[PDB]
Ligand binder design. Structure first.
Ligand SMILES: CCCCCn1ccc2c(C(=O)Nc3nnnn3C)ccnc21
Ligand SMILES: CCCCCn1ccc2c(C(=O)Nc3nnnn3C)ccnc21
Ligand SMILES: [Co+2]
Ligand SMILES: [Co+2]
Lengths: 382, 382
């Protein structure tokens, strides 16, 4: 059941912002590893004396990488006179975030009808303000509230081309990489306690529970906007298990709550994973270990309806996971952590079914793969 | 004249250590961009709870990228019980370095006969101690003194395979990239005052002046070991010029003195630059703007002895600079800055001449290219 209870008009995921120590090196690694184009910049060359910000795009997916310059470059500025293109940026907050968490997502940004209204309604409904609404060049409004840990939910609204003060990247520097990724499907937080986290976020957004999960080491639940295109799962650890909770491992290495993974939808997950796997050892991203061939021997018994044995053969080569709802089927795979710490990682997914356009969350989030991978591992020892 | 006055036995450049916020992303970017192999690691997976360190190699060139983990992972350790593999590492020093300078070189490491003797003699001769000699697994001794700014000169000596506690990288993760780079040729510091800097470094090493330079915006001089294989140039700015000194720009954006560039010798600079230029826009390194065709039209008049017109044609395609000594010829090119700030960059070089092996510094360091590039620019306006 979908009570359609959003307290303000939400459209789509807009962008994800990473706070880095060096935005250049992270952005170039991600660009090559994920096949994203360099599409906009705000930095010294555009007159920004405060922060360096580089935008990568693939389809509708927008990854922003930001790092501070020396505060000495902008010591004479005040907020009214700032050369920053993102007004919520703060040297001290950014350095504190990165020193505490390492490389990670600072902002999950959603496009709304009216960012000032969204901020006002959010705060009136319990949200903790982070950055008040600010109008950029009478064209875009941006506002931020706290989501979990040091991650903020960022509202962006446009009157009528990322942000004012960002310049389009010249095509000689913008190589048209594309491995098939097209949009952000969901963004998942890890927190120490799920109940209070859900009550807080659902409280100021009005997002409704879409799904929920629960020996796997976690409990989780998914918050969703009215049309269920903005999906915000949250995990908490389950203590006492023989194998230690990876949610707890995350919290320890991340120094508390934060964004656990970003799921990126591909229009052709086989092409995406072929392209990403070719680059894993030459600057790209590594993938989690493949499931045993038992898992794929069982796959015919569960999705032989949807995938040909040739297409299942291809899943086995690429190490792709498959799960199935009563409503749709999900193809998914997980990278190893994106940086030094065993914290944030990326999920590549593709959904089949729920045609009306495709409805959000078609096929779920892969809950069934906990059991079937444990079963497949038991069957391999044989 | 070479007074051969080293106060201790110096062998060769051993490695360069970068202090990063995320070693993973910088190391993968550098590996792809420069064609270096992932060859050793010390991190969580090897039991290091303190820092993540990844070693890249090409020929004899060794680039080390290190970042701190959360201090909470190692809060119960003390120096006698540390899981760090580099004993000079300190969470606070590393975070302070990176927050102040951004991505940069922390250590210029040279292999010596006896690192404890080298440290003792250095300090007895005015060096500022940074990390006392420490014996690792009765196999390697490491010690550090201050060089300039927050950069240290690191001594390493081996009794009889990077460092103890580092593990060789498994070949499945170690892709054998190689674009022709073979060793570090020289490493250059920028300081506010050259005299005191030279007096300090030459004082504790006994390195002798190899060369010196001086409207270009700087004054410089080169310190060299007995056989002139360890070359340590130092630059200071020249104020008042119409165009602002890039040495001064460095000092402002770096928050003081530091390492300006690393010159990497290639066994085939044409292959190296073809390979690096192919990757500039897909995660690698960008190069400084090419000199005008006038520069190459003049090149026949100065090195037509050494390079065929076909080989000069190839320099023009790749944007390679050429300078010439009375003793040898130098091919060189410069990258754009390696990170967000206009601070550290890389030079690719190849030397021809001075065959005995090749003697160090053959062809100089390119001083003649200041005039000839200014001349070539004047001739292009035509
Ligand atoms: C034993 C590992 C085998 C794969 C099990 N496995 C299945 C899904 C999944 C997610 C994930 O994608 N979780 C999510 N995404 N949105 N909501 N949630 C809760 C993250 C980490 N391991 C996962
Ligand atoms: C106007 C720019 C045209 C190139 C002029 N140009 C010639 C050499 C050079 C170095 C360099 O390599 N300097 C060095 N290396 N070792 N010692 N020194 C002093 C660094 C930056 N621009 C340089
Ligand atoms: Co997921
Ligand atoms: Co040089």
């Amino acid at each position: 059941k979908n009570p359609k209870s959003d307290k303000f008009k939400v459209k789509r995921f807009h962008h994800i912002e990473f706070w880095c120590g060096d935005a250049t090196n992270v952005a170039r690694r991600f660009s090559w590893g994920l096949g994203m184009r360099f599409s906009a910049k705000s930095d010294l060359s555009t007159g920004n004396m405060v922060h360096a910000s580089y935008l990568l795009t693939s389809g509708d997916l927008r990854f922003l990488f930001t790092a501070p310059y020396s505060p000495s470059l902008s010591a004479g500025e005040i907020k009214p006179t700032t050369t920053a293109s993102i007004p919520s940026f703060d040297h001290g907050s950014c350095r504190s975030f990165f020193s505490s968490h390492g490389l990670g997502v600072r902002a999950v940004a959603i496009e709304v009808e009216d960012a000032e209204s969204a901020f006002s309604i959010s705060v009136a409904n319990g949200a903790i303000p982070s950055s008040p609404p600010i109008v950029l060049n009478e064209a875009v409004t941006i506002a931020e509230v706290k989501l979990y840990g040091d991650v903020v939910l960022r509202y962006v609204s446009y009157k009528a081309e990322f942000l004012p003060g960002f310049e389009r990247v010249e095509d000689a520097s913008s190589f048209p990489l594309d491995y098939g990724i097209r949009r952000l499907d969901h963004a998942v937080g890890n927190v120490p306690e799920l109940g209070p986290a859900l009550t807080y976020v659902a409280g100021f957004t009005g997002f409704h529970q879409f799904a929920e999960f629960t020996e796997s080491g976690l409990n989780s639940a998914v918050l969703a906007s009215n049309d269920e295109m903005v999906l915000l799962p949250i995990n908490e650890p389950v203590h006492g298990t023989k194998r230690k909770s990876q949610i707890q491992t995350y919290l320890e290495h991340n120094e508390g709550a934060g964004l656990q993974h970003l799921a990126l939808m591909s229009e052709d997950i086989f092409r995406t994973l072929r392209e990403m796997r070719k680059r894993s050892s030459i600057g790209g991203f590594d993938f989690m270990p493949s499931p045993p061939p038992t898992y794929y021997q069982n796959l015919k018994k569960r999705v032989g309806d949807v995938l040909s044995d040739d297409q299942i053969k291809e899943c086995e080569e690429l190490g792709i996971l498959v799960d199935r709802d009563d409503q749709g089927t999900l193809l998914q795979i997980f990278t190893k952590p994106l940086g030094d710490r065993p914290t944030i990682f990326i999920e590549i997914i593709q959904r089949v079914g729920c045609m009306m356009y495709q409805s959000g969350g078609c096929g779920g989030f892969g809950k069934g793969n906990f059991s079937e991978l444990f079963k497949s591992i038991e069957e391999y020892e044989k």
